[PDB]
Amino acid sequence: FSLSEYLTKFQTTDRESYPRLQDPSRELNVIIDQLAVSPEQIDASPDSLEALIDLCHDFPHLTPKLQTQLSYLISSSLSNLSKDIKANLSSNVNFTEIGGLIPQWKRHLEEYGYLIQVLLTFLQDELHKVSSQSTNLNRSAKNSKNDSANVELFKRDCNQMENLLESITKLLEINLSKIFQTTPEKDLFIGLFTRPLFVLLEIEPVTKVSS
């Protein structure tokens, strides 16, 4: 797996013209069953690579239960992998074994960074869509029939947004100058984690909430 050509495949080209998978539930549930016991095991099989990278790409085409459990998948996998690399690097172990796991660590981080990039990009797209045509979505008071579903969509995307930013806060505790060696690739990784936040901050009621 590589980062830069996939990142310029997502960013420069069109994003909402991605193909639609015929049955997402069985493939994402067996992905869950792979990832309920091992968060790093997408690497070893390229069908799981392409399966994850295109079950993330169709994020405005799923059902909300599937969306929330995919967000919990991404947050749980990032939190477990960040805790594992933190427990490995903070210990007094030699540089040889952590250097042997550092291509696994760096390519797993490329995978998860691309997934977090596309989820935060589609999430800010949907939040800009639901907050553009509305008046005030900071609270659920003084609503209507469709407005209650609108503000419930607001709260559920903001809650999975909070879970994703929880995963991001859990990521950046590790010394990423150990993981990412040179400053172009480190700049690219921190930039792909920080760019969708800086485009998310355009939304006026997103900065109005507190968490």
């Binding site: 540089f95 060696q181 040179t182 400053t183 172009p184 930039g191 760019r195």
Partner: protein, 465 residues
Amino acid sequence: MKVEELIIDGFKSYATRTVITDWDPQFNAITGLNGSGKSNILDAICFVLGIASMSTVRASSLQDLIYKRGQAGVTKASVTIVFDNTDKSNSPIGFTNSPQISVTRQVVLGGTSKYLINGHRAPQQSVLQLFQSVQLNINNPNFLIMQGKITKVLNMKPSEILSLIEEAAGTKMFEDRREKAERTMSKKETKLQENRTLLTEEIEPKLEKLRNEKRMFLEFQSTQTDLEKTERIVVSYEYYFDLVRNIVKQNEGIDLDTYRERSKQLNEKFQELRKKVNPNIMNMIENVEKKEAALKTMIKTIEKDKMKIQETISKLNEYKRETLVKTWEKVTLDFGNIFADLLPNSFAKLVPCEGKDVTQGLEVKVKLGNIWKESLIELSGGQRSLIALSLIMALLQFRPAPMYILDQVDAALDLSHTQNIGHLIKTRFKGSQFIVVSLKEGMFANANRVFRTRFQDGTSVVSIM
């Protein structure tokens, strides 16, 4: 909208709170001696309906309408009018669920006026749109003949005689809004053209300079990777505690002096390209590319917006012209019949001007007997008063305005035509509230309500005679 109460506070000849009630919905008639305040009652009604040109209210300013110019204790001038709404067919839009509509205009010294509907404040466009819906427009009236202006309706230019028929048809409120729309679109068009040439001259040159330094930044990032590989190898090889041994045993035996001068020749390009290009130009070019694309999409949508508005007003002009012709035929027929009934062995028609179109202006042509008058300047003041009154009543017979204000339309009519006008307002032209100021007894003796006006102690009073 039959007027039910008129409350005048601090107006021209009215120093106190004068409340005029008991208005009959068919025919009200105001009388009194000279200098009593009748035309000031009509000026209060014109002022509460909204005036721009203060020469029809007979003032040179707005503080000239307050009592003794506001320098006699009454520093405010407020006019209140109350309309009944038992008939919902002539009701305005949105106000159907209110059986009484009150409109008040206030002016204090120094500043300008302010309007309130039913106690609650409102700007002037709200009350002007309220009164332009039951065709009670004072700025271009088809219901207001002020004092001494009854023998001068036939002296009007053909655009004004066209505008009366236009107000009867319902398209004057479209015509002034269309002219305002063309003026506003021209001003926003030259503003948008200035913005387009500013975009062409000032943005895309700097955008292509940004693209130039973008590709130089990809070259600088290639040298960046060159530094963080080669200089790291260099500082590792002069540092020689086991990791440096492991990164020595892949490149065993690299020459020192060539690597040192290669590091120097890389750092001189680095100190050049450090002051050449900023390291964060990729997010900057992404930001300005998104801004330029959204800007051009906005300009395309603005141009398509102007095209849609222009094609829609060009499509509405045809229905305006068709309803103007359909109004003009019925109005000139009822004009001829009402003038034949008022003055016997006579006739009058509304004709488009010589060679031009109906929508360019209209002219009155008068027949007395079997001969056509080539010019209506040779007619008397009484005949011209009868032609003007018959034109206003033909406009009533098309679509009756609720309030017809007549300030001494009988000053040039004789004692037969005055009684005939009073009878024809009492009997024939039912369907409007007439507020007529007269001094001839043959007009207000055929009245359903009579208000005397008197001057006492410095102020004016209205007594229900």
